[PDB]
């Protein structure tokens, strides 16, 4: 079948250089156009420009003309689009597309590439507890702060405990770290005796804990 | 040079109802038009293209029609994988582009939110900044509003919020909102309040504690 593989996803700084491809496998490379679409965070589909890899020949989006270059290598099957200086404007998503030229729509996509561009370098979090009542439903969490880049990872009692589980998206503070809360709706009868500890992991940094999470006293 | 105009731009629909989105260009198009789907973490796919052909491998619940300048998608009767955001495209004339995209949620009855508020940890305020956070729990739809109060003072500019997914067994969202300040700021006043405004409920509810209270 028709495949198109993209590179993996790009942590940058402002003012650096990226060079990201996108390879076309289980049909002829050079007798297709492959379109790149930008989707920043929350955002729509942009067409940035497109290029027919048996010649090179390339149009661009009026947006995008002079912002990047898009290329090809047919020896390998592989298409680019590159940056010679990034901004964190550039922080999206990446899909590369086949374009099909009887009706001219894009019937294989890639499975994209998340560029993110950053002036804030790697953190690992800090996790503190969401405490619950210790005086029924009630809710308790983990606050995971002031990390850089995204992902991390969160379960609860190494993953025993899935019921009424809500892991938030993280987000994006001024100070270009982010902050994300996972919490758990549980009985309040079992505050006193049910241990409640969140597994938070920021591989970036190579950041793991585990905190246990109860009532407070006063 | 083409502007490609979609509506609405939000949908919510019971799961068998018939669903329309509508896509505009500022000129004709003759039938270059594609509609794509976008589930949430994945590529899009096409799903109709030349305005009304089904691509191989899409149920026939999908149709398109129109032609010119206006274009509809239609989803005959909605099944939860269905739940997604839709692009429509032109393809009639270079810059190719892209509707905005039309988000369809599913509908379920309307659900007041469970709210819940914790106050900073002391591990936390060590480090010179207080975050309080207020958890707003299974509610729908997902339209709500958090309003922070420090001894009755309305906060704004000072918070940023979050919303999960829609649940696939509940249909039901849930909502973090985190109040952040400095220390000595938190330490100054008592009161800490977070007041959640929802369709489902008919006045706004209200959790709060006084810094100290655990």
């Known amino acids: 079948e028709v495949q198109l593989v993209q590179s993996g996803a790009e942590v940058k700084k402002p003012g650096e250089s990226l060079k990201i491809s996108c390879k076309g496998s289980?049909?002829?490379?050079?007798?297709?156009?492959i379109g790149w679409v930008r989707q920043m965070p929350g955002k729509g589909l942009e067409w940035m420009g497109i290029?027919?890899?048996?010649?090179?020949?390339?149009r661009y989006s009026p947006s995008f003309q002079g912002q990047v270059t898009i290329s090809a290598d047919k020896s390998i099957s592989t298409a680019y689009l590159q940056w010679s200086s990034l901004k964190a404007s550039d922080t999206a998503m990446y899909y590369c597309?086949?374009?099909?030229?009887?009706?001219?729509?894009?019937?294989?996509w890639g499975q994209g590439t998340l560029v993110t561009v950053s002036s804030a370098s790697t953190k690992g979090p800090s996790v503190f507890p969401l405490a619950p009542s210790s005086k029924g439903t009630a809710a308790l969490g983990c606050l995971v702060k002031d990390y850089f880049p995204e992902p991390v990872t969160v379960s609860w009692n190494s993953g025993a405990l899935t019921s009424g589980v809500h892991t938030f998206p993280a987000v994006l503070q001024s100070s270009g770290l982010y902050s994300l809360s996972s919490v758990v709706t549980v009985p309040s009868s079992s505050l006193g005796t049910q241990t409640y500890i969140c597994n938070v992991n920021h591989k970036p940094s190579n950041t793991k804990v585990d905190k246990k999470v109860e009532p407070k006293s006063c | 040079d083409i502007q490609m105009t979609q509506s609405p731009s939000s949908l919510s629909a019971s799961v068998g109802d018939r669903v329309t989105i509508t896509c505009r260009a500022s000129?004709?198009?003759?039938?270059?038009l594609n509609w794509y789907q976008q589930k949430p973490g994945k590529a899009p796919k096409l799903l109709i293209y030349?305005?009304?052909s089904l691509q191989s491998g899409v149920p026939s619940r999908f149709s398109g029609s129109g032609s010119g300048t206006d274009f509809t998608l239609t989803i005959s009767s909605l099944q939860p994988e269905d739940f997604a955001t839709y692009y429509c495209?032109?393809?009639?004339?270079?810059?190719?582009?892209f509707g905005q995209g039309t988000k369809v949620e599913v509908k379920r009855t309307v659900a007041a939110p469970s709210v819940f508020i914790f106050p900073p940890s002391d591990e936390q305020l060590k480090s010179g900044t207080a975050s309080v956070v207020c958890l707003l729990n299974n509610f729908y739809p997902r339209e709500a509003k958090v309003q922070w109060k420090v001894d009755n003072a309305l906060q704004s500019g000072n918070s940023q919020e979050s919303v999960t997914e829609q649940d696939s067994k509940d249909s039901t969202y849930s909502l973090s909102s985190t109040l952040t300040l400095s220390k000595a700021d938190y330490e100054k006043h008592k009161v800490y309040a977070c007041e959640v405004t929802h369709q489902g409920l008919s006045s706004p509810v209200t959790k709060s504690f006084n810094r100290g209270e655990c």
């Open positions: 030349a305005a009304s």
């Open positions: 290029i027919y890899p048996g010649d090179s020949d390339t």
């Open positions: 495209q032109q393809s009639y004339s270079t810059p190719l582009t």
């Open positions: 000129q004709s198009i003759s039938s270059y």
């Open positions: 597309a086949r374009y099909d030229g009887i009706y001219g729509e894009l019937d294989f």
């Open positions: 289980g049909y002829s490379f050079t007798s297709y156009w």
